[PDB]
């Protein structure tokens, strides 16, 4: 038995600079995962252990991928540096723990990448306007990859605290139009990203342009929601994992919306991408996404 | 973020030298676990992820203890070799404080819980100890049992006789190596089964009435160390009912009824029927690793 490598957030960052290297293996993983028993992924739905005394939670997210031949576990905490994560990478041939690495950078990057994959498939024709609700870590990681991958004529932002949206707009490279309400930000928007910690709906279907695509990334708890019933039930609903969406997403559970497809099914050709219709991609994240990122990082680090 | 501490196997051993210090917090943890919600332990049943391509398995064992105010996760692999690591978090903010070897922790806490069960359940006049198996668990059980108890004779059987002789010459006191399980258990007051046998090796017919058995091996729903006569005739104690019903082939395949959790005995909710033949079926649970990891981390961080 020997000690694992430790890779800091900076070291992870140094080995995850290129979305063109992250997107392809994510697409493959989503597809393989959605094949279920016809693929090679073993991923139990995330386990959450409450830490009631301190208003905290520990998420446990193991996965094995036969196709990548990779074995990982992400451990994530949230306390009401509030979000923290670590990823463990094992030698799949003998179980040895090879690496413990920061999970924060990975969470930022793989989440944004999965949203970008969904948007490539689901954005309507004439997607000129992007709208981001929220101004935190995920707002930044999404903005980064979306402006790399796509060309929008306008990017808009609303945030609960306007000052933080204005800081965002000052910090990032391109022009961001800070809006005074959600309604203003989303009216006329073709692609929407919701990356907030809202617990009750902030985005109402009445305001959404027919055909818009929404990446619904927040409200990551079964009692929490970012979207109203009109939007959840009017939109064609795509998810990352059916099992996770029906356990963890308040938007899905409380609206009672039918799930049309997993993103992986669209990628593999099993289900259609109805980009012309108003679409919601409800994202929860899942262990195999962390596995893909951790493997990329580890392979890059270990090869020099 | 601050880098976590990494504690190797030898550093863990260096900070778990005293069973005297490990037993009391384990007793409290077992009692609190068995109290259920009001005991403050959050411990989901072990998740096992198969790695079929390499004939392996990953088990993930998280726990929170309100009483100790500690948050851990053990990750263990078994490949058809067992390797474990324990992560210890700051419970107030989720920061990863330590990554430590899990093999030494597992060896120590398992032996300690067997010792707790044995203190409660060994028959009056217990003079003879028998160990079946001769691997890591045999060593840890031997160390703590000869420290906590006073046996007049210790016997051992192992499938491979050479490894039992190596054990007998390696450990401090006298060990009588026996050529069969039956020989080793005949007349024994306390028995420890620490093998990877998949089919029964220990038959109730051979067990002295009143004997206490710590059944530590066959840690899979399709594996067994004990026969039906022993499992059905003995008073059956476990660490976790839920885990025993999911993970133990001895319990599942025999159809035996579980009398009590060890924690219920400790708290007084269930009696210790030490006069009867008793089996403590140990699966292990996350809160035991939590106790040991906290003791280790606290000792190490103190200097
Ligand atoms: N689908 C997935 O895979 C992943 C999901 N997430 C989820 O994404 C969301 C954003 O995460 P992250 O960027 O790291 O978090 P951050 O803490 O960095 O930012 C949180 C954002 O939510 C806003 N906010 C907090 N409370 C409310 C509220 N009551 N109403 C409206 N906005 C609010 C904040 O605004 P303000 O400036 O006013 O404080 C801020 O813009 C979270 O819900 C998170 O759980 C994260 C990663 C994985
Ligand atoms: N209840 C709990 O909390 C814990 C449970 N365990 C379980 O305890 C047992 C021992 O673990 P450990 O000491 O680490 O393992 P080791 O690998 O160190 O030793 C294995 C032992 O099992 C024997 N053995 C292997 N196959 C058979 C067989 N078919 N029949 C009879 N004996 C056999 C070996 O004998 P030989 O020399 O001939 O190979 C050896 O004595 C295992 O079953 C393990 O899963 C351990 C961790 C915690
Ligand atoms: N959503 C991000 C960050 C995040 C992680 C965790 I653990 C969180 O706590 C809970 C609490 C109860 C639950 O039932 C669930 I599901 C999650 C929250 I709120 C957010 C991620 O997945 O990393
Ligand atoms: N018993 C020791 C070591 C150990 C750990 C693991 I993961 C093992 O593999 C499986 C495979 C399928 C299962 O259903 C179960 I339950 C366990 C085995 I065999 C042994 C411990 O608990 O650490
Ligand atoms: K659309
Ligand atoms: K007894």
Domain spans of chain B?
Answer: 1-122+285-303, 123-284
Whether B301 contacts chain A with CB within 8 A: no
Calpha distance A190→A128 (Å, rounded) = 6
Q: Do B54 and A92 touch (CB under 8 A)?
A: yes
CATH fold of A1-123+286-304 reads ornithine cyclodeaminase, domain 1 (3.30.1780)
Letter string b/e over residues B272-295, b meaning 16 or more CB atoms within 10 A of that residue's CB = bbbebbbbbbbbbbbbbbbbbbbb
Letter string b/e over residues A39-67, b meaning 16 or more CB atoms within 10 A of that residue's CB = bbbbbebbbbbebeebebbbbbbbbbbbb
Whether B44 contacts chain A with CB within 8 A: yes
The partner residues of A130 in beta bridges, in order of sequence, read: A155, A191
- Give the annotated binding-site residues of B: 46, 81-82, 109, 134, 136-137, 158-160, 163, 195-196, 216, 247, 282
List gaps in chain B by the residue before each (C–N > 2.5 Å). Answer: 80
A12-20: Cβ within 8 A, 24+ apart: A12/A101, A12/A102, A12/A105, A12/A106, A12/A297, A13/A105, A15/A296, A15/A297, A15/A300, A15/A301, A16/A105, A16/A106, A16/A109, A16/A293, A16/A296, A16/A297, A19/A109, A19/A113, A19/A116, A19/A145, A19/A148, A19/A149
Q: From the CB of B195, is ligand 4 less than 6 Å away?
A: no
Quote the longest CA-to-CA distance of chain A. Answer: 60
Tokens found for residue B290: 């939590």
Nearest CA to B31 out of B256, B217, B291 is that of B291
DSSP letter (8 states) at residue B202 = B
CATH (one of 1.10.579.10, 3.30.43.10, 1.20.120.1200, 3.40.50.720) for A124-285: 3.40.50.720
The partner residues of B193 in beta bridges, in order of sequence, read: B132, B215
Determine the residue of A197, A202, A247, A285 to mutate for testing ligand 1's pocket, defined as the one with the most ligand atoms within 8 A of the Cβ atom: A197
Q: Do B54 and A94 touch (CB under 8 A)?
A: yes
Q: According to the entry, how was the structure determined?
A: X-ray
Neighbours of B36 (CB within 10 A): 10
Calpha distance B289→B105 (Å, rounded) = 7
Report helix, strand or coil for B212.
strand
Chain A to chain B Cβ contacts (< 8 Å) = 134
Calpha distance A223→A261 (Å, rounded) = 22
Calpha distance A291→A26 (Å, rounded) = 9
CATH (one of 3.40.630.10, 3.40.718.10, 1.20.1090.10, 3.40.50.720) for B123-284: 3.40.50.720
Determine the residue of A160, A165, A226 to mutate for testing ligand 1's pocket, defined as the one with the most ligand atoms within 8 A of the Cβ atom: A160
Determine the residue of B76, B249, B252 to mutate for testing ligand 4's pocket, defined as the one with the most ligand atoms within 8 A of the Cβ atom: B76
Which residues in chain B touch residue A7, judged by CB atoms under 8 angstroms apart? Answer: none
Tokens found for residue A67: 């196709």
CATH fold of B1-122+285-303 reads ornithine cyclodeaminase, domain 1 (3.30.1780)
Instruction: Write out residues with Cβ below 6 Å of ligand 1.
Output: A 83, 107, 111, 134-139, 159-161, 164, 195-199, 202, 217-218, 220, 283-285
CA distance A84 to chain B (A): 7
Q: At what angle do helices B103-121 and B136-148 cross, to 10 degrees?
A: 40
In angstroms and rounded to an integer, the radius of gyration of the C-alpha atoms of chain A is: 19
* CA-closest residue to ligand 4 atom 17: B220
Neighbours of B268 (CB within 10 A): 9
In ligand 1, which atom is closest to the CA atom of A134? 41
Residue B103: φ, ψ to 5°: -65, -45
Segment holding B67, helix H or strand E? none
DSSP letter (8 states) at residue B27 = H
Q: Do A75 and B73 touch (CB under 8 A)?
A: yes
**What is each CA distance from B253 to A68, A170, B225, B229, in whole angstroms?**
37, 67, 11, 12
Nearest CA to A128 out of A154, A156, A157 is that of A154
Of B49, B71, B99, the CB nearest to A64: B49
């Amino acid at each position: 038995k020997r000690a694992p490598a430790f890779l800091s957030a900076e070291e992870v960052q140094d080995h995850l600079r290129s979305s063109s290297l992250l997107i392809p293996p994510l697409e493959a993983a989503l597809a393989n995962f959605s094949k279920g028993p016809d693929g090679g992924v073993m991923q139990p739905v995330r386990t959450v252990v409450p830490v009631a005394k301190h208003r905290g939670f520990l998420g446990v997210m193991p996965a094995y991928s036969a196709a990548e031949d990779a074995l990982t576990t992400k451990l994530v905490t949230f306390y009401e540096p509030s979000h923290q994560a670590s990823v463990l990478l094992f030698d799949p041939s003998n179980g040895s723990l090879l690496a413990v690495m920061d999970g924060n950078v990975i969470t930022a990057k793989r989440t944004a990448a999965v949203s970008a994959i969904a948007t490539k498939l689901l954005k309507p024709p004439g997607s000129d306007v992007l709208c981001i609700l929220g101004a935190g870590v995920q707002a930044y990681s999404h903005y980064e990859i979306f402006t790399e991958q796509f060309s929008f004529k306008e990017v808009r932002m609303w945030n609960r605290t306007r000052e933080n949206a204005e800081k965002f707009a000052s910090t990032v490279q391109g022009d961001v139009r800070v809006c005074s309400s959600v309604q203003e930000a989303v009216t006329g928007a073709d692609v929407i990203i919701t990356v907030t910690m809202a617990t009750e709906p902030i985005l109402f279907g009445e305001w959404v342009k027919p055909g818009a695509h929404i990446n619904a990334v927040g409200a990551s708890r079964p009692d929490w929601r970012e979207l109203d019933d009109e939007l959840m039930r009017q939109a064609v609903l795509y998810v990352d994992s059916r099992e996770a969406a029906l356990k963890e997403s308040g938007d899905v559970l409380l609206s009672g919306a039918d799930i049309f497809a997993e993103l992986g099914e669209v990628i593999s050709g099993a289900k259609p991408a109805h980009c012309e219709k108003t679409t919601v991609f409800k994202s929860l994240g899942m262990a195999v996404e962390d596995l893909v990122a951790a493997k990329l990082v580890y392979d890059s680090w270990s090869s020099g």
